[PDB]
Short mmCIF file of C-alpha atoms in Angstrom, two decimals:
data_model
loop_
_atom_site.label_atom_id
_atom_site.label_comp_id
_atom_site.label_asym_id
_atom_site.label_seq_id
_atom_site.Cartn_x
_atom_site.Cartn_y
_atom_site.Cartn_z
CA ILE A 1 -2.55 -7.80 -1.47
CA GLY A 2 1.07 -9.03 -0.62
CA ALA A 3 3.07 -12.06 -1.39
CA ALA A 4 5.00 -14.94 0.37
CA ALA A 5 4.56 -15.84 -2.60
CA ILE A 6 0.95 -17.11 -1.09
CA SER A 7 -1.76 -14.47 -1.90
CA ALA A 8 -1.49 -13.29 1.92
CA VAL A 9 0.50 -10.41 3.57
CA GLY A 10 3.38 -12.08 5.49
CA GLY A 11 5.40 -11.27 8.41
CA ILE A 12 2.99 -9.77 10.73
CA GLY A 13 3.76 -7.39 12.71
CA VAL A 14 1.69 -6.36 15.29
CA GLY A 15 3.85 -5.83 18.62
CA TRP A 16 3.86 -2.06 17.98
CA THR A 17 0.42 -1.89 19.64
CA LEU A 18 1.83 -3.39 22.82
CA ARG A 19 5.53 -2.58 23.31
CA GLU A 20 8.35 -0.33 22.01
CA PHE A 21 8.75 -1.26 18.46
CA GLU A 22 12.15 -0.91 16.66
CA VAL A 23 12.18 0.23 13.17
CA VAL A 24 13.80 -1.61 10.26
CA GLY A 25 16.89 0.40 8.90
CA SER A 26 17.79 1.40 5.41
CA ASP A 27 20.16 -0.56 2.94
CA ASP A 28 22.83 1.52 1.34
CA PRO A 29 23.81 0.64 -2.17
CA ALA A 30 27.84 0.50 -3.33
CA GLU A 31 29.37 3.51 -4.94
CA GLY A 32 30.93 1.28 -7.83
CA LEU A 33 27.64 0.39 -9.26
CA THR A 34 25.84 -0.14 -12.59
CA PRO A 35 22.68 1.87 -13.28
CA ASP A 36 20.61 -1.51 -14.15
CA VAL A 37 21.94 -2.79 -10.55
CA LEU A 38 21.17 0.56 -8.81
CA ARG A 39 17.65 0.50 -10.15
CA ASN A 40 17.06 -3.27 -9.13
CA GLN A 41 18.42 -2.49 -5.63
CA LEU A 42 16.43 0.63 -5.05
CA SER A 43 13.14 -1.26 -6.49
CA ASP A 44 13.93 -4.04 -4.04
CA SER A 45 14.09 -1.58 -0.93
CA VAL A 46 10.82 0.08 -1.87
CA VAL A 47 9.04 -3.38 -2.15
CA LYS A 48 10.92 -4.49 1.15
CA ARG A 49 9.66 -1.11 3.02
CA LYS A 50 6.22 -1.32 1.61
CA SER A 51 5.70 -5.11 2.48
CA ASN A 52 7.13 -4.28 6.00
CA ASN A 53 4.94 -1.27 6.64
CA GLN A 54 1.89 -3.40 5.25
CA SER A 55 2.62 -6.16 7.64
CA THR A 56 3.07 -3.83 10.72
CA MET A 57 1.26 -0.43 10.50
CA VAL A 58 -0.83 0.01 7.38
CA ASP A 59 -2.70 -3.44 6.94
CA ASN A 60 -3.60 -4.42 10.49
CA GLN A 61 -6.57 -1.85 10.80
CA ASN A 62 -9.17 -4.44 12.19
CA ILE A 63 -6.95 -5.01 15.36
CA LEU A 64 -7.25 -1.61 16.58
CA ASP A 65 -10.49 -2.35 18.59
CA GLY A 66 -7.90 -4.43 20.55
CA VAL A 67 -5.75 -1.46 21.28
CA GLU A 68 -9.01 -0.05 22.91
CA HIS A 69 -9.45 -3.11 25.00
CA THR A 70 -5.79 -3.06 26.14
CA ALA A 71 -6.18 0.63 27.00
CA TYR A 72 -9.34 0.02 28.87
CA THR A 73 -7.68 -2.95 30.72
CA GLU A 74 -4.88 -0.78 31.84
CA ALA A 75 -6.86 2.40 32.83
CA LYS A 76 -9.46 0.54 34.82
CA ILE A 77 -6.85 -1.34 36.76
CA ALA A 78 -5.16 2.15 37.75
CA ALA A 79 -8.60 3.48 38.57
CA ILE A 80 -9.41 0.45 40.73
CA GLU A 81 -6.33 0.86 42.76
CA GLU A 82 -7.21 4.76 43.34
CA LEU A 83 -10.98 3.78 44.03
CA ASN A 84 -9.76 1.27 46.71
CA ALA A 85 -7.61 3.86 48.35
CA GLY A 86 -10.57 6.11 48.94
CA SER A 87 -8.97 8.75 46.64
CA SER A 88 -10.96 11.87 44.98
CA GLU A 89 -12.64 11.39 41.60
CA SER A 90 -9.78 13.65 39.89
CA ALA A 91 -7.30 11.31 41.69
CA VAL A 92 -9.05 8.10 40.12
CA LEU A 93 -9.37 9.70 36.69
CA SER A 94 -5.65 10.99 36.95
CA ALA A 95 -4.43 7.34 37.41
CA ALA A 96 -6.50 5.82 34.74
CA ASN A 97 -5.78 8.80 32.05
CA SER A 98 -1.84 8.33 33.02
CA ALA A 99 -2.03 4.84 31.97
CA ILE A 100 -3.68 5.87 28.77
CA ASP A 101 -1.19 8.63 28.31
CA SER A 102 1.83 6.12 28.42
CA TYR A 103 0.02 3.57 26.22
CA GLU A 104 -0.96 6.09 23.55
CA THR A 105 2.52 7.70 23.59
CA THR A 106 4.09 4.25 22.89
CA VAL A 107 1.52 3.34 20.06
CA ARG A 108 1.60 6.66 18.54
CA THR A 109 5.55 6.96 18.61
CA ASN A 110 5.98 3.34 17.14
CA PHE A 111 3.67 4.48 14.27
CA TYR A 112 5.26 7.70 13.52
CA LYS A 113 8.83 6.24 14.04
CA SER A 114 8.03 3.76 11.07
CA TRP A 115 6.76 6.77 8.91
CA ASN A 116 9.88 8.87 9.70
CA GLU A 117 12.14 5.84 8.72
CA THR A 118 10.15 5.28 5.29
CA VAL A 119 10.58 8.97 4.55
CA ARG A 120 14.37 9.17 5.81
CA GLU A 121 15.16 6.22 3.51
CA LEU A 122 13.46 7.83 0.48
CA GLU A 123 15.88 10.82 1.26
CA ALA A 124 18.81 8.49 1.33
CA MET A 125 17.78 6.77 -1.88
CA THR A 126 17.30 10.17 -3.50
CA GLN A 127 20.77 11.19 -2.40
CA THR A 128 22.24 8.06 -3.76
CA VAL A 129 20.69 8.64 -7.14
CA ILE A 130 21.95 12.42 -7.05
CA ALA A 131 25.58 10.89 -6.42
CA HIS A 132 25.50 8.05 -8.92
CA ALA A 133 24.18 10.36 -11.74
CA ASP A 134 23.54 7.53 -14.26
CA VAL A 135 19.92 7.02 -12.74
CA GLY A 136 17.36 9.92 -13.03
CA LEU A 137 15.47 11.25 -10.02
CA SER A 138 12.40 10.43 -12.08
CA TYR A 139 13.10 6.71 -11.23
CA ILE A 140 13.09 7.21 -7.28
CA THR A 141 10.74 10.24 -6.77
CA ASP A 142 7.73 10.06 -9.07
CA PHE A 143 4.88 11.99 -7.48
CA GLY A 144 2.88 12.66 -10.75
CA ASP A 145 4.97 14.84 -12.95
CA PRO A 146 8.80 13.68 -12.52
CA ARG A 147 10.26 16.60 -14.58
CA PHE A 148 13.48 17.78 -12.80
CA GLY A 149 14.88 20.13 -15.52
CA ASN A 150 15.01 23.19 -13.60
CA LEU A 151 16.31 21.60 -10.30
CA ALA A 152 19.91 22.41 -9.31
CA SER A 153 22.75 20.19 -9.36
CA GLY A 154 23.41 18.23 -6.12
CA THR A 155 20.00 19.60 -4.64
CA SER A 156 17.43 17.22 -3.57
CA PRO A 157 13.74 17.68 -4.73
CA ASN A 158 12.70 16.48 -0.97
CA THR A 159 12.58 18.30 2.15
CA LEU A 160 12.03 16.63 5.66
CA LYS A 161 10.31 19.12 7.84
CA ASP A 162 10.42 18.67 11.47
CA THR A 163 6.66 18.70 12.90
CA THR A 164 6.26 18.78 16.54
CA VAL A 165 3.54 16.20 17.94
CA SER A 166 2.22 16.73 21.48
CA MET A 167 2.34 13.32 22.91
CA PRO A 168 -0.33 12.60 25.60
CA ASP A 169 2.41 12.02 28.44
CA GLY A 170 3.49 15.80 28.19
CA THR A 171 6.53 15.15 25.99
CA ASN A 172 7.10 16.39 22.20
CA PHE A 173 7.79 13.98 19.20
CA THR A 174 9.45 15.21 15.89
CA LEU A 175 7.27 13.87 13.05
CA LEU A 176 8.92 14.14 9.56
CA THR A 177 6.59 16.02 7.33
CA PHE A 178 7.64 15.02 3.59
CA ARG A 179 7.59 18.03 1.25
CA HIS A 180 8.54 17.35 -2.55
CA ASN A 181 9.05 19.89 -5.26
CA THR A 182 10.15 19.20 -8.72
CA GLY A 183 11.99 22.75 -8.87
CA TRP A 184 9.65 24.72 -11.44
CA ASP A 185 8.40 28.18 -10.51
CA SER A 186 4.99 28.63 -9.33
CA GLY A 187 3.39 29.85 -12.83
CA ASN A 188 4.90 27.01 -14.66
CA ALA A 189 2.53 24.35 -16.24
CA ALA A 190 5.02 21.60 -14.97
CA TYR A 191 5.15 22.98 -11.43
CA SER A 192 4.46 20.06 -8.92
CA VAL A 193 4.72 20.11 -5.21
CA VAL A 194 3.23 17.77 -2.45
CA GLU A 195 3.63 18.08 1.39
CA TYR A 196 2.22 15.47 3.67
CA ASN A 197 2.55 13.08 6.75
CA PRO A 198 0.13 10.42 8.35
CA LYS A 199 -1.92 13.25 9.97
CA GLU A 200 -2.74 15.67 7.07
CA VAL A 201 -2.05 16.74 3.42
CA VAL A 202 -0.48 20.44 3.74
CA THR A 203 -0.33 20.95 -0.15
CA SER A 204 -0.94 19.16 -3.45
CA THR A 205 -0.28 20.87 -6.81
CA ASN A 206 -0.13 18.75 -9.75
CA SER A 207 0.73 15.73 -7.19
CA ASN A 208 -0.03 12.24 -5.91
CA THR A 209 0.24 11.82 -2.13
CA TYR A 210 2.11 8.70 -2.88
CA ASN A 211 5.39 7.73 -4.50
CA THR A 212 5.58 5.42 -7.62
CA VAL A 213 8.90 3.56 -7.90
CA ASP A 214 9.21 0.71 -10.63
CA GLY A 215 5.28 0.50 -10.80
CA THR A 216 5.28 0.16 -6.77
CA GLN A 217 2.88 2.74 -4.99
CA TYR A 218 3.97 3.39 -1.52
CA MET A 219 3.82 6.11 1.11
CA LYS A 220 0.04 6.25 0.41
CA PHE A 221 -1.51 9.18 2.48
CA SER A 222 -4.98 7.26 2.24
CA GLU A 223 -3.14 4.09 3.94
CA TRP A 224 -1.29 5.97 6.61
CA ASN A 225 -4.09 8.47 7.42
CA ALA A 226 -6.63 5.52 7.82
CA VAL A 227 -4.46 4.14 10.61
CA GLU A 228 -4.17 7.55 11.97
CA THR A 229 -7.84 8.52 12.09
CA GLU A 230 -8.82 4.98 13.57
CA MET A 231 -6.03 5.53 16.33
CA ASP A 232 -7.64 8.98 17.04
CA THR A 233 -11.04 7.27 17.26
CA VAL A 234 -9.76 4.39 19.63
CA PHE A 235 -8.21 6.88 22.05
CA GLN A 236 -10.87 9.13 22.13
CA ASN A 237 -13.46 6.33 22.82
CA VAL A 238 -11.14 5.08 25.73
CA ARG A 239 -10.76 8.37 27.33
CA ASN A 240 -14.53 9.24 26.97
CA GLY A 241 -15.40 5.73 28.02
CA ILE A 242 -13.19 5.75 31.23
CA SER A 243 -14.60 9.16 32.20
CA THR A 244 -18.28 7.70 31.93
CA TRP A 245 -17.06 4.57 33.77
CA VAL A 246 -15.55 6.36 36.83
CA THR A 247 -18.53 8.85 36.87
CA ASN A 248 -20.95 5.95 37.14
CA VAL A 249 -18.51 3.69 39.39
CA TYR A 250 -17.45 6.25 41.74
CA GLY A 251 -19.01 5.69 45.26
CA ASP A 252 -21.17 2.70 44.58
CA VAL A 253 -18.20 0.09 43.82
CA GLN A 254 -17.07 -0.41 47.47
CA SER A 255 -13.42 0.06 48.27
CA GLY A 256 -11.89 -3.30 48.28
CA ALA A 257 -14.55 -5.21 46.35
CA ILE A 258 -12.15 -5.73 43.41
CA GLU A 259 -8.39 -6.79 44.10
CA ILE A 260 -6.37 -6.63 40.94
CA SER A 261 -2.92 -5.24 42.44
CA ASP A 262 -1.17 -8.64 41.34
CA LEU A 263 -3.11 -9.42 38.12
CA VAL A 264 -1.11 -10.46 34.95
CA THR A 265 -2.83 -8.53 32.01
CA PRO A 266 -2.76 -10.19 28.53
CA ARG A 267 -0.42 -7.30 27.43
CA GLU A 268 2.16 -8.28 30.16
CA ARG A 269 1.81 -11.89 29.20
CA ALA A 270 2.64 -11.37 25.63
CA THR A 271 5.45 -9.12 26.47
CA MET A 272 7.01 -11.86 28.77
CA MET A 273 6.90 -14.26 25.83
CA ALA A 274 8.96 -11.74 23.68
CA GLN A 275 12.04 -12.02 26.25
CA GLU A 276 11.40 -15.91 26.62
CA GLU A 277 10.76 -18.16 23.57
CA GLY A 278 7.90 -20.74 23.50
CA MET A 279 5.61 -19.57 20.68
CA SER A 280 5.54 -17.18 17.77
CA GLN A 281 5.32 -13.36 18.90
CA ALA A 282 2.36 -12.38 16.54
CA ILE A 283 -0.51 -15.09 17.71
CA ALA A 284 0.74 -14.11 21.27
CA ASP A 285 0.08 -10.45 20.44
CA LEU A 286 -3.11 -11.17 18.51
CA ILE A 287 -4.41 -13.03 21.90
CA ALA A 288 -3.43 -10.03 24.03
CA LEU A 289 -5.48 -7.84 21.45
CA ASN A 290 -8.23 -10.12 22.16
CA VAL A 291 -8.83 -11.29 18.51
CA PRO A 292 -10.93 -14.52 18.28
CA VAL A 293 -8.49 -17.46 17.67
CA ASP A 294 -9.02 -21.27 17.19
CA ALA A 295 -6.42 -22.89 19.61
CA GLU A 296 -8.01 -26.27 19.86
CA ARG A 297 -7.98 -27.34 16.08
CA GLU A 298 -5.20 -27.57 13.25
CA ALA A 299 -6.31 -26.58 9.77
CA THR A 300 -4.51 -27.76 6.50
CA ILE A 301 -5.19 -25.13 4.00
CA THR A 302 -4.60 -25.02 0.15
CA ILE A 303 -4.22 -21.68 -1.87
CA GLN A 304 -6.32 -22.01 -5.03
CA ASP A 305 -4.26 -19.76 -7.64
CA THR A 306 -0.77 -21.08 -6.13
CA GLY A 307 -1.32 -24.78 -5.33
CA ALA A 308 0.39 -24.40 -2.03
CA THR A 309 -0.81 -26.43 0.93
CA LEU A 310 -0.06 -25.57 4.53
CA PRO A 311 -1.12 -26.83 8.04
CA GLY A 312 -1.73 -24.09 10.78
CA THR A 313 -4.13 -22.22 13.13
CA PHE A 314 -6.72 -19.51 12.23
CA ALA A 315 -7.56 -16.14 13.77
CA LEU A 316 -10.62 -13.86 12.83
CA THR A 317 -10.77 -10.23 13.85
CA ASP A 318 -14.49 -10.65 13.34
CA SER A 319 -15.86 -14.09 14.50
CA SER A 320 -19.26 -13.32 12.65
CA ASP A 321 -17.25 -14.18 9.58
CA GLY A 322 -18.70 -17.68 10.23
CA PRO A 323 -17.41 -20.92 10.88
CA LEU A 324 -14.55 -22.06 8.63
CA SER A 325 -15.63 -25.56 7.52
CA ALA A 326 -13.39 -28.33 5.87
CA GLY A 327 -14.27 -28.97 2.26
CA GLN A 328 -15.39 -25.47 1.75
CA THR A 329 -13.60 -22.65 -0.21
CA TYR A 330 -13.44 -19.25 1.13
CA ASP A 331 -12.58 -15.65 -0.36
CA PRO A 332 -11.27 -13.21 2.34
CA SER A 333 -12.21 -10.25 -0.01
CA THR A 334 -15.81 -10.93 0.81
CA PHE A 335 -15.25 -11.23 4.72
CA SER A 336 -15.97 -8.32 7.16
CA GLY A 337 -12.95 -8.77 9.09
CA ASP A 338 -9.46 -10.01 8.45
CA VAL A 339 -8.34 -13.65 8.30
CA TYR A 340 -4.95 -14.45 10.15
CA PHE A 341 -3.18 -17.74 9.71
CA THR A 342 -0.09 -18.66 11.76
CA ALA A 343 1.78 -21.75 10.21
CA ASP A 344 5.20 -23.38 10.01
CA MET A 345 6.62 -22.13 6.90
CA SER A 346 9.10 -24.91 6.71
CA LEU A 347 6.21 -27.22 5.61
CA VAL A 348 5.02 -24.93 2.68
CA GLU A 349 4.65 -27.53 -0.43
CA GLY A 350 2.80 -27.60 -3.69
CA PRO A 351 2.92 -28.97 -7.25
CA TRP A 352 4.76 -26.98 -10.07
CA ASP A 353 3.03 -27.65 -13.14
CA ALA A 354 4.50 -24.52 -15.01
CA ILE A 355 7.61 -26.39 -16.29
CA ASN A 356 8.87 -27.53 -19.80
CA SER A 357 9.03 -31.14 -20.56
CA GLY A 358 12.47 -31.09 -22.34
CA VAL A 359 15.90 -31.11 -20.27
CA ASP A 360 18.12 -30.08 -23.13
CA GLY A 361 21.69 -30.33 -22.32
CA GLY A 362 21.23 -30.19 -18.67
CA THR A 363 18.92 -26.89 -18.81
CA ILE A 364 15.53 -26.97 -17.01
CA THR A 365 13.11 -24.26 -18.16
CA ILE A 366 9.96 -22.85 -16.08
CA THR A 367 7.21 -20.84 -17.47
CA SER A 368 6.46 -18.72 -14.23
CA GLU A 369 8.46 -16.98 -11.60
CA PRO A 370 10.05 -19.19 -8.84
CA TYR A 371 8.88 -18.21 -5.39
CA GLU A 372 11.18 -16.58 -2.87
CA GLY A 373 12.30 -18.86 -0.13
CA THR A 374 11.11 -22.10 -1.93
CA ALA A 375 13.16 -24.53 -4.01
CA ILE A 376 11.61 -26.37 -7.18
CA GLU A 377 12.36 -30.00 -6.87
CA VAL A 378 12.42 -31.26 -10.49
CA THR A 379 12.12 -35.14 -11.10
CA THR A 380 13.36 -36.32 -14.41
CA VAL A 381 11.90 -39.20 -16.32
CA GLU A 382 15.15 -41.23 -15.18
CA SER A 383 13.96 -40.90 -11.68
CA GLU A 384 16.60 -38.26 -10.76
CA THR A 385 15.86 -35.34 -8.62
CA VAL A 386 17.29 -31.87 -8.59
CA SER A 387 16.53 -29.12 -5.85
CA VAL A 388 16.69 -25.70 -7.41
CA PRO A 389 16.23 -22.75 -4.97
CA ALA A 390 14.40 -19.55 -6.64
CA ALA A 391 17.70 -17.41 -6.43
CA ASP A 392 19.56 -20.07 -8.78
CA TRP A 393 16.89 -19.70 -11.53
CA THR A 394 18.28 -17.34 -14.49
CA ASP A 395 15.50 -14.93 -15.87
CA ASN A 396 15.36 -15.17 -19.69
CA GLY A 397 13.12 -12.20 -20.00
CA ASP A 398 10.81 -14.38 -22.16
CA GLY A 399 8.38 -15.03 -19.40
CA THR A 400 10.63 -18.02 -18.81
CA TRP A 401 13.20 -19.04 -16.19
CA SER A 402 16.18 -21.50 -16.72
CA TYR A 403 18.66 -23.45 -14.57
CA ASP A 404 21.59 -25.60 -15.76
CA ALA A 405 21.50 -29.15 -14.09
CA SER A 406 24.54 -30.56 -15.73
CA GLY A 407 26.46 -30.97 -12.60
CA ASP A 408 23.48 -32.20 -10.77
CA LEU A 409 22.08 -34.95 -13.14
CA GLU A 410 23.72 -38.06 -14.46
CA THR A 411 21.61 -37.87 -17.75
CA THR A 412 21.41 -34.25 -18.79
CA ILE A 413 19.35 -35.06 -22.09
CA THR A 414 16.11 -36.21 -20.62
CA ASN A 415 12.52 -35.11 -19.77
CA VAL A 416 10.63 -33.77 -16.56
CA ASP A 417 8.36 -36.27 -14.98
CA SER A 418 7.00 -33.77 -12.47
CA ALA A 419 8.07 -30.82 -10.35
CA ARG A 420 7.10 -29.59 -6.90
CA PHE A 421 7.89 -26.46 -4.77
CA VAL A 422 9.17 -27.07 -1.29
CA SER A 423 10.48 -24.46 1.58
CA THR A 424 14.17 -23.94 1.89
CA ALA A 425 13.83 -23.43 5.66
CA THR A 426 16.39 -25.52 7.46
CA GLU A 427 14.22 -25.54 10.81
CA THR A 428 10.77 -24.83 11.93
CA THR A 429 10.05 -21.15 11.37
CA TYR A 430 6.72 -19.92 12.43
CA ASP A 431 4.98 -16.93 10.68
CA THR A 432 1.55 -15.11 10.91
CA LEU A 433 0.00 -14.33 7.50
CA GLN A 434 -3.03 -12.20 6.70
CA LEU A 435 -4.84 -14.39 3.95
CA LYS A 436 -6.02 -12.29 0.97
CA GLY A 437 -6.73 -14.67 -1.64
CA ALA A 438 -8.89 -17.60 -2.01
CA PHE A 439 -8.16 -20.58 0.21
CA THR A 440 -9.87 -24.12 0.64
CA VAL A 441 -9.84 -25.68 4.19
CA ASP A 442 -8.72 -29.34 3.39
CA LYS A 443 -9.00 -30.97 6.86
CA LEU A 444 -9.40 -29.70 10.55
CA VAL A 445 -7.38 -31.83 12.99
CA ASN A 446 -8.59 -31.57 16.77
CA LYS A 447 -5.47 -31.53 19.02
CA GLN A 448 -4.34 -33.64 20.89
CA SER A 449 -6.81 -36.62 19.76
CA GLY A 450 -6.27 -36.12 16.14
CA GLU A 451 -9.81 -36.34 15.20
CA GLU A 452 -11.34 -34.71 11.82
CA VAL A 453 -13.94 -32.08 12.62
CA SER A 454 -16.38 -30.50 10.32
CA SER A 455 -16.25 -26.77 11.57
CA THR A 456 -13.99 -24.37 13.55
CA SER A 457 -15.01 -22.65 16.95
CA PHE A 458 -13.25 -19.25 17.85
CA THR A 459 -12.64 -17.94 21.46
CA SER A 460 -12.09 -14.62 22.97
CA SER A 461 -12.52 -12.62 26.44
CA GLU A 462 -15.40 -10.29 27.30
CA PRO A 463 -14.80 -6.94 25.16
CA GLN A 464 -14.42 -3.96 27.48
CA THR A 465 -17.06 -1.31 27.67
CA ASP A 466 -17.60 2.09 29.28
CA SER A 467 -19.80 0.18 31.92
CA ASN A 468 -18.35 -3.24 32.43
CA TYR A 469 -15.39 -5.05 34.60
CA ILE A 470 -17.27 -4.04 37.78
CA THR A 471 -17.20 -7.58 39.38
CA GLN A 472 -14.22 -9.59 40.37
CA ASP A 473 -15.45 -12.59 38.24
CA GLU A 474 -15.18 -10.39 35.03
CA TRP A 475 -11.55 -9.80 35.90
CA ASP A 476 -10.98 -13.40 37.21
CA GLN A 477 -12.05 -14.73 33.67
CA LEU A 478 -9.99 -12.19 31.79
CA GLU A 479 -6.73 -13.57 33.45
CA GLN A 480 -8.02 -17.24 33.40
CA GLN A 481 -9.32 -17.33 29.85
CA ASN A 482 -5.98 -15.52 28.46
CA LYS A 483 -3.38 -17.91 30.52
CA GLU A 484 -5.09 -21.11 29.22
CA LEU A 485 -5.18 -19.67 25.66
CA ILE A 486 -1.39 -19.14 25.90
CA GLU A 487 -0.94 -22.70 27.53
CA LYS A 488 -2.78 -24.08 24.28
CA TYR A 489 -0.17 -22.65 21.88
CA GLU A 490 2.65 -24.36 24.25
#
């Protein structure tokens, strides 16, 4: 339940399941700061971190079956090479599991790296509050009972404990276990201590396994552990599945029957699209994870509550979420899987009806919060227009925002005729959103004929199982179906 400010979770965020992913760093506030400003900057950092974690690790749960697909592709190729060489069953499984080892290490390391950064940032934010001393710890570290009365001066209530994780490739990774203690002795009614990480909750006494900063709940164990337990399931299924696969394939599949030595895997295809521009990375990644996508059509969508309209291509994690027909309204909260929408964000536009009629001494007033990355284009009754980007709207704290257009308008005492919001993007900027709120499909444009079609048709390659990809045709179709999907977005 994110914002763009379209009901959807924006800036996805899925390459961490296919490549080494670099974490987003912390923002350090200035020494000479006001408590009101420090509190706003800390709240903004928490919102940004939560939004980043949602769009990457936390909210892409239904694409983890694609990780299983990627892991099967990679392990089976490694096994086929060994089978063709007339190797022992142990050597065949060794090559397949070494492929899973390296793939799991990358996915797990990326996931734990982003937790470590979240948890390191909180400690950096805590240290700032301790140093500024005009802001209380209860503002930045609230885990249920934020009473820091018995905590020593210059001491953090947090402890980042080093926890060794045994990576499948034989290496060790340092996962940071977050411990928080308000400072009271065991025996006091106020005693509050929490200790957890994405893997487990060590202790929770008069505590929440999530932090609350300016009404925002983040570092949720339930959210982080959900991805952790799903990751465990996926790599257990691949290893058990590849064992069953090799046991049933060893000896009967002739050495030389399948030749995949020069195969370009959907994973390899998407990683080459990262170093060479040509399409947005997330839809290339969603294709590599074998998520059903609609490449042939172009949907003009309109968000019910917002009023924003957008042209773009769909993606469903579950194709059984039925066809998305034009003229119909859909609520993604009812759906079995997730809806992804890839659109050119420079084309975001909609009507802004939450505006006061009067333009008094050049001042324009709006009755709703302006959306980030958009400008409200206000047209007066004298047929003059002023473009006001969200950052220029001054908050009155009355539930109203105002802007002084005395320097922009010729007639400063007038009335608003109409107002609309449009994107502030200078160029075509592609983005992949996970639609969370109700949307209506206005029209479906079939490329490159421009025809108006009634419904959508999603496509994906054959899902990998513990018994398939035995024939060369299954493998030939995998490379062919994938390379023509990438071509359709180029």
